[PDB]
Amino acid sequence: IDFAISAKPLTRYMPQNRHTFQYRVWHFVVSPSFEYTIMAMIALNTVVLMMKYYSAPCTYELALKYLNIAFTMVFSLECVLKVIAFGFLNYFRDTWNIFDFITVIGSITEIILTDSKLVNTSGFNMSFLKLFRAARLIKLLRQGY
Ligand SMILES: CC(C)CCC[C@@H](C)[C@H]1CC[C@H]2[C@@H]3CC=C4C[C@@H](OC(=O)CCC(=O)O)CC[C@]4(C)[C@H]3CC[C@]12C
Ligand SMILES: CC(C)CCC[C@@H](C)[C@H]1CC[C@H]2[C@@H]3CC=C4C[C@@H](OC(=O)CCC(=O)O)CC[C@]4(C)[C@H]3CC[C@]12C
């Protein structure tokens, strides 16, 4: 029970400036119209991962392609909305953000390499990049405790 040896610090992410940007976005990030509106985008994104099936009409496969993009942008827009509102160094210190950073930087590059302008050759395969967009399911584990 004597963990008073640690756990001294608290939040300490206050910008405390009423600043032009930093205390304009930080107010947006906190005070849920964002905490529940990103807990709803990781709720529909765990439904477009279950909606893949075998022999889809090729316009079902296309609706999922443009939905996956429409969640990657939202999750990437989240990513550059917390480097701004918290600062770069205070962002990469929760370990639940450098997880959400990796999944988005790994799913941004899944959209590109499976698109044109770059070829899938040189004996290296983009099949393992599907794990990065199927790892957004673990973002639901965060609201366990
Ligand atoms: C968290 C959950 C409760 C929300 C929604 C998830 C499931 C209820 C949905 C998502 C994807 C669906 C699947 C998507 C595709 C198919 C193929 C489909 O096969 C056909 O094309 C034949 C008949 C048909 O068109 O449904 C049969 C239903 C099934 C398995 C669906 C069953 C219901 C699933 C699992
Ligand atoms: C974004 C989240 C909430 C996913 C839930 C959306 C689904 C309710 C939508 C998205 C893609 C839709 C599908 C896209 C393509 C088709 C093929 C379509 O078959 C056709 O050939 C008709 C017209 C066409 O798409 O060319 C019939 C409807 C269906 C199954 C749609 C049914 C409704 C779906 C599953």
> Are 31 and 20 within 8 A, CB to CB?
no
The DSSP code for 46 is: T
Which residue's alpha carbon is at the smallest distance from atom 14 of ligand 2? 60
Q: How far apart are CA 51 and CA 61, in angstroms?
A: 9
Note the resolution in Å, 1 decimal: 3.1
Ligand 2 neighbours, Cβ below 6 Å, are 44, 47-48, 57, 59-60, 63, 67
Instruction: Report residue 25: phi and psi, to 5°.
Output: -90, -35
The experimental method is: cryo-EM
Q: Ligand 1: which of 45, 53, 61 to mutate, judged by most atoms within 8 Å of the beta carbon?
A: 53
CB-CB contact of 51 with 57 (8 Å): no
The burial of 30, by beta-carbon neighbours within 10 Å (0-12 exposed, 13-18 middle, 19 or more buried), is given as middle
Q: Is 145 helix (H, G, I), strand (E, B) or coil?
A: coil
